[PDB]
Amino acid sequence: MNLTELKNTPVSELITLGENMGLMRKQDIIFAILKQHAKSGEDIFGDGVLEILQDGFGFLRSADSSYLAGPDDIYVSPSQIRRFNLRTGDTISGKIRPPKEGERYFALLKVNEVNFDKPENARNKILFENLTPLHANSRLRMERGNGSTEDLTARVLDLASPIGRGQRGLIVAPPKAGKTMLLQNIAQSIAYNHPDCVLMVLLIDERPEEVTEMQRLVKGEVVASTFDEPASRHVQVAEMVIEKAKRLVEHKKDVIILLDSITRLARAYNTVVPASGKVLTGGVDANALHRPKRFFGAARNVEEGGSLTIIATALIDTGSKMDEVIYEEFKGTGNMELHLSRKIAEKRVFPAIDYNRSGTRKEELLTTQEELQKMWILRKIIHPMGEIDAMEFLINKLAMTKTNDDFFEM
Amino acid sequence: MNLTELKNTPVSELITLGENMRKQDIIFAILKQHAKSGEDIFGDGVLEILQDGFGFLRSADSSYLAGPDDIYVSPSQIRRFNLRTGDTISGKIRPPKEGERYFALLKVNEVNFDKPENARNKILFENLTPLHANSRLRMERGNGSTEDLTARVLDLASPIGRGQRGLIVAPPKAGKTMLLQNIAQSIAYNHPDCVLMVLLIDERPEEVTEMQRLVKGEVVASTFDEPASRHVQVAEMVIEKAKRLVEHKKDVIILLDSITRLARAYNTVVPASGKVLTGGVDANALHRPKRFFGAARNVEEGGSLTIIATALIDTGSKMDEVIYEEFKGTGNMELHLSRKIAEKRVFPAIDYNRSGTRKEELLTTQEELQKMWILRKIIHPMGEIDAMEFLINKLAMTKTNDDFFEM
RNA sequence: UUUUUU
Numbered sequence: 001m002n003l004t005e006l007k008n009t010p011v012s013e014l015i016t017l018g019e020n021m022g023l024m025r026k027q028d029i030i031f032a033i034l035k036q037h038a039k040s041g042e043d044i045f046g047d048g049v050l051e052i053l054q055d056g057f058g059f060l061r062s063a064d065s066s067y068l069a070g071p072d073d074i075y076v077s078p079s080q081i082r083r084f085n086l087r088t089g090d091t092i093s094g095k096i097r098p099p100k101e102g103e104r105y106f107a108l109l110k111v112n113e114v115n116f117d118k119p120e121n122a123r124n125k126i127l128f129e130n131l132t133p134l135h136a137n138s139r140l141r142m143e144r145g146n147g148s149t150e151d152l153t154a155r156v157l158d159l160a161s162p163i164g165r166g167q168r169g170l171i172v173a174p175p176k177a178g179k180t181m182l183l184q185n186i187a188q189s190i191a192y193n194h195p196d197c198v199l200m201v202l203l204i205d206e207r208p209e210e211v212t213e214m215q216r217l218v219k220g221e222v223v224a225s226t227f228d229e230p231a232s233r234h235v236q237v238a239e240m241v242i243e244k245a246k247r248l249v250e251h252k253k254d255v256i257i258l259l260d261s262i263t264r265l266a267r268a269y270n271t272v273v274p275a276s277g278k279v280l281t282g283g284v285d286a287n288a289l290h291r292p293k294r295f296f297g298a299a300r301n302v303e304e305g306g307s308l309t310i311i312a313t314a315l316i317d318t319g320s321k322m323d324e325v326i327y328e329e330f331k332g333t334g335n336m337e338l339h340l341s342r343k344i345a346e347k348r349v350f351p352a353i354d355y356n357r358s359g360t361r362k363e364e365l366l367t368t369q370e371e372l373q374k375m376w377i378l379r380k381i382i383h384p385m386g387e388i389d390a391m392e393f394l395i396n397k398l399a400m401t402k403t404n405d406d407f408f409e410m
Numbered sequence: 411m412n413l414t415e416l417k418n419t420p421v422s423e424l425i426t427l428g429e430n431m432r433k434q435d436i437i438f439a440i441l442k443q444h445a446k447s448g449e450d451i452f453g454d455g456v457l458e459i460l461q462d463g464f465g466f467l468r469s470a471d472s473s474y475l476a477g478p479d480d481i482y483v484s485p486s487q488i489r490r491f492n493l494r495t496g497d498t499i500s501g502k503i504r505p506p507k508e509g510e511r512y513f514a515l516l517k518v519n520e521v522n523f524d525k526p527e528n529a530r531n532k533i534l535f536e537n538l539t540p541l542h543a544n545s546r547l548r549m550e551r552g553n554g555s556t557e558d559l560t561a562r563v564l565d566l567a568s569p570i571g572r573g574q575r576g577l578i579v580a581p582p583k584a585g586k587t588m589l590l591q592n593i594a595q596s597i598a599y600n601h602p603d604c605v606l607m608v609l610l611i612d613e614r615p616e617e618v619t620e621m622q623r624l625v626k627g628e629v630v631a632s633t634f635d636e637p638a639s640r641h642v643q644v645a646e647m648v649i650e651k652a653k654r655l656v657e658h659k660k661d662v663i664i665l666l667d668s669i670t671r672l673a674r675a676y677n678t679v680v681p682a683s684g685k686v687l688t689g690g691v692d693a694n695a696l697h698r699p700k701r702f703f704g705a706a707r708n709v710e711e712g713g714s715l716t717i718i719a720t721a722l723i724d725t726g727s728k729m730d731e732v733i734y735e736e737f738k739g740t741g742n743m744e745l746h747l748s749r750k751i752a753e754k755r756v757f758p759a760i761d762y763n764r765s766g767t768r769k770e771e772l773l774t775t776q777e778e779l780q781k782m783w784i785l786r787k788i789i790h791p792m793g794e795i796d797a798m799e800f801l802i803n804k805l806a807m808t809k810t811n812d813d814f815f816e817m
Numbered sequence: 818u819u820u821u822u823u
């Protein structure tokens with residue numbers, strides 16, 4: 001019946017349909033199954049994400065290829081685009097027919113769904129670039145409230161630096177400070193308390209095993225480009241994922257991108273960027289931080305509905321200036337920053353947060369005056385201490401209570 | 411009757427054989443008379459695909475260098491089993507014809523120690539699924555030797571599992587190179603199953619000599635005398651070969667020495683870019699070092715690739731400190747030694763505070779975790795010399811199992 | 818390459 005489902009199904013299950021149907025590697029099999037079905041006059045359909053090209057024609061890339069070239073892409077004539085003012089990144093599904101003689105890929109016969117809805121109103125929606133941005137109004141609690149070793153990290157986060165819809169936050173740390181895992185922890189908390197928010201996890205250049213473990217423990221879009229992949233691929237994949245987010249927000253949707261190693265993407269851009277000379281400090285070109293700044297500055301809050309929030313990990317104290325530079329370039333664009341110390345982790349104390357450098361901007365919109373000056377006191381009391389001291393202190397002070405309970409107490 | 415054997419055979423020995431039947435000249439002669447009557451010949455090597463599409467079979471004595479006795483491999487055959495560089499091949503062969511200068515692959519008998527036919531079903535390495543280390547690699551020995559102390563402390567400070575992308579950092583003179591030797595011997599005794607390769611790139615040649623005579627396995631090497639270009643090629647041959655076996659679901663462990671030297675050899679050999687990183691190291695000169703080191707991994711399909719290499723710090727350049735940070739962010743088993751603790755002649759000079767591996771909980775049992783955690787809490791305070799001596803004495807008492815138990 | 822970048 002449908003392509004994607006045919007490509008999902010196991011090898012052996014396809015085979016029983018083949019013999020029963022009537023009549024070779026999996027690709028061959030599914031193609032053969034499709035042709036007979038199509039000759040019978042029965043409808044066919046696949047699903048993919050739009051990618052307009054230079055010549056004006058576009059394709060429907062698959063998620064199982066990081067949205068890069070795929071032998072199963074579906075052609076979308078320029079005619080089909082102008083008909084629904086489609087843009088790169090739109091998620092489309094519809095009836096399609098196999099490649100006639102000569103034609104190499106399947107073709108989009110007719111469109112049914114544009115970004116999960118009807119393409120007839122997806123022409124009246126206001127453009128992403130003309131939306132009206134705001135600070136985070138609505139809020140995102142991370143304390144699922146489960147009295148566990150993990151909900152500690154969530155709570156501490158919820159206290160040090162709160163998150164809101166449209167959060168352009170950033171998690172700064174030096175290798176092995178728990179950043180990546182903290183991201184994982186944030187992911188799971190968002191899934192439990194916010195199934196309504198669409199979750200996309202983008203891993204640019206971080207560890208292979210991390211991607212596979214992420215997929216299994218995370219519910220949602222998991223796109224990745226390991227360090228195996230060249231910088232070319234990293235930029236392609238990430239740029240595809242950012243446009244996809246933009247499009248859904250256009251449909252007044254709330255999306256959440258978790259990017260591991262944003263600075264890795266900054267380096268990937270660096271190599272890709274044409275040398276302008278005037279190399280900045282740390283061997284970083286002057287124009288190489290435009291695209292990445294534009295990628296991060298993309299997250300925002302819309303006054304007409306939906307929103308896009310990006311939380312990425314930054315790298316500091318690594319012997320290189322590049323990282324210091326990239327940290328300041330994004331800190332001067334984001335709305336939230338959370339630092340972790342390389343020392344609150346060597347002690348094995350977790351989460352190893354540097355509560356002194358953490359914090360978000362415009363907190364009085366993401367909290368009630370009471371919780372506000374509650375955290376303000378918690379801040380005052382801790383500032384004078386040290387990194388590990390403050391933490392251990394902080395932690396065991398709430399190891400025995402709920403977030404609100406702890407409050408009432410203290 | 412077999413090329414490889416005739417090659418390693420001493421010049422004077424097989425002289426007797428000759429009469430009943432230049433040394434390179436003679437070997438050519440000797441095979442050609444073995445081929446005259448139709449008697450078979452047998453050779454072996456590691457395929458190296460080239461731009462033309464056809465490949466050669468490199469030998470270990472050449473260090474996988476261009477070799478005169480190499481076996482040409484028709485692209486025809488490669489397609490037959492879709493081979494790739496680094497594969498180990500052996501099979502029937504015939505003597506080079508007049509005009510022809512090198513030997514050719516008549517037929518294939520076995521690919522990667524396995525019947526040639528099976529290659530088609532094997533899943534590609536890049537398409538394999540990774541995970542955090544599952545099985546555990548213990549260096550501890552019941553021997554209770556004077557030297558076993560290092561294996562035991564390392565086993566405590568920083569566990570190693572299958573597919574462990576480890577890294578060992580110290581200032582020169584810290585016994586980091588020699589620890590690597592020790593580590594090499596330990597898995598040799600406790601793990602015959604694991605395929606063992608030792609790669610020495612650039613660092614000293616006496617070390618090469620020491621290692622080969624004392625290590626049970628393959629010893630690929632490239633002294634610093636050699637330009638940066640072989641260092642690259644020899645290392646790349648090794649890593650590809652290691653990837654081949656993991657495709658077979660085998661367990662490969664590479665004890666790379668002077669990984670920073672490899673990164674530097676990559677730096678010396680790289681297209682110029684306008685930007686340069688701190689330390690002089692090129693901004694775009696670390697992708698290849700990263701992919702090489704990040705090659706190690708764990709597979710659900712079966713088999714594993716484990717790479718553990720030496721890293722230099724407090725070098726006097728920042729290249730080295732920057733490169734340490736770079737692999738730090740890729741690996742999952744960092745190690746450290748200190749000059750101050752090696753000064754006093756106390757060994758290992760291991761710095762427990764800085765040492766550590768990621769996701770130890772899967773490698774160690776709950777009991778193992780608690781004792782380790784207790785230990786680290788107690789040692790954290792103590793100084794490198796004081797702390798180290800402090801545990802060493804207790805370690806001399808009993809192997810780590812008994813020591814933690816009495817504790 | 819010099820400047821920038823180290």
Ligand SMILES: Nc1ncnc2c1ncn2[C@@H]1O[C@H](COP(=O)(O)OP(=O)(O)O)[C@@H](O)[C@H]1O
Pocket residue numbers: 153173174175176177178179180181182345350351352739767768769770
């Ligand atoms: N909260 C925590 N709980 C348990 N282990 C942790 C925690 N934070 C850090 N770690 C340990 O630190 C290691 C590396 O941290 P990770 O966040 O993966 O690195 P990075 O921050 O550089 O991405 C992990 O393998 C884990 O064992």
Ligand SMILES: Nc1ncnc2c1ncn2[C@@H]1O[C@H](COP(=O)(O)OP(=O)(O)O)[C@@H](O)[C@H]1O
Pocket residue numbers: 560580581582583584585586587588589757758
């Ligand atoms: N555990 C040890 N026992 C005895 N000698 C040691 C020990 N560790 C290091 N050394 C000495 O330190 C010297 C330098 O260490 P080595 O690891 O060989 O060089 P590097 O650490 O620079 O690679 C060695 O020659 C060795 O004699």
Ligand code: BEF
Pocket residue numbers: 173174175176177179180206315738739740
């Ligand atoms: F080493 Be972490 F992933 F920055």
Ligand code: BEF
Pocket residue numbers: 331332333
């Ligand atoms: F981050 Be500020 F706007 F310089």
Ligand code: BEF
Pocket residue numbers: 581582583587613
């Ligand atoms: F010269 Be040693 F290997 F630091």
Ligand SMILES: [Mg+2]
Pocket residue numbers: 179180181206
């Ligand atoms: Mg990380």
Ligand SMILES: [Mg+2]
Pocket residue numbers: 586587588613
């Ligand atoms: Mg050495």
